[PDB]
Amino acid sequence: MNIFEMLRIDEGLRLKIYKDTEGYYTIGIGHLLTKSPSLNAAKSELDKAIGRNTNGVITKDEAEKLFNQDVDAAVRGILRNAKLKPIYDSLDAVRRAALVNMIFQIGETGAAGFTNSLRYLQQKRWDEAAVNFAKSRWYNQTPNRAKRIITVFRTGTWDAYKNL
Ligand SMILES: [Cl-]
Numbered sequence: 001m002n003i004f005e006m007l008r009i010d011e012g013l014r015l016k017i018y019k020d021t022e023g024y025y026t027i028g029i030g031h032l033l034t035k036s037p038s039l040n041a042a043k044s045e046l047d048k049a050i051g052r053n054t055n056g057v058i059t060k061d062e063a064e065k066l067f068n069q070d071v072d073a074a075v076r077g078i079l080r081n082a083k084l085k086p087i088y089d090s091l092d093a094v095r096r097a098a099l100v101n102m103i104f105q106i107g108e109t110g111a112a113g114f115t116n117s118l119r120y121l122q123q124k125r126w127d128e129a130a131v132n133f134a135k136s137r138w139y140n141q142t143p144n145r146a147k148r149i150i151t152v153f154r155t156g157t158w159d160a161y162k163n164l
């Protein structure tokens with residue numbers, strides 16, 4: 001298990017534009033195109049992203065390409081965020097992957113509201129952090145995925161993904 005395999009499980013792989021759990025145009029492996037309700041707008045974002053006139057469908061390789069970029073950018077942003085870098089640095093590799101996964105899903109902006117949870121992680125108060133994390137719109141809207149992420153923060157193991 002690793003960040004790529006974990007997010008592949010969590011996001012799936014689709015080669016045509018589709019809408020994510022929030023109703024937003026996405027493609028590939030969780031690659032958010034835009035929050036605009038305009039499909040053409042989405043398609044334009046896709047073409048810009050891939051570098052060609054696609055007509056809304058991409059190859060697996062292309063999908064993987066955006067994914068790699070996406071994972072990298074997620075890490076990079078965490079490293080550049082003064083509110084997150086410290087948490088990230090205080091963690092073991094398994095938990096770090098869970099934090100990257102969260103940011104990939106909700107963004108740094110979405111992570112701003114987790115200050116308290118992040119603090120519990122920093123204190124290594126695993127069960128306390130787990131309880132806290134669950135008290136969020138994030139958990140309520142994507143409970144199965146959030147539960148997985150939370151078990152990783154709680155245990156430092158991949159057990160939640162192990163059988164998927
Ligand atoms: Cl992009």
Ligand SMILES: [Cl-]
Binds near residue numbers: 142144
């Ligand atoms: Cl879910």
Ligand SMILES: [K+]
Binds near residue numbers: 010011020021029030
């Ligand atoms: K998805």
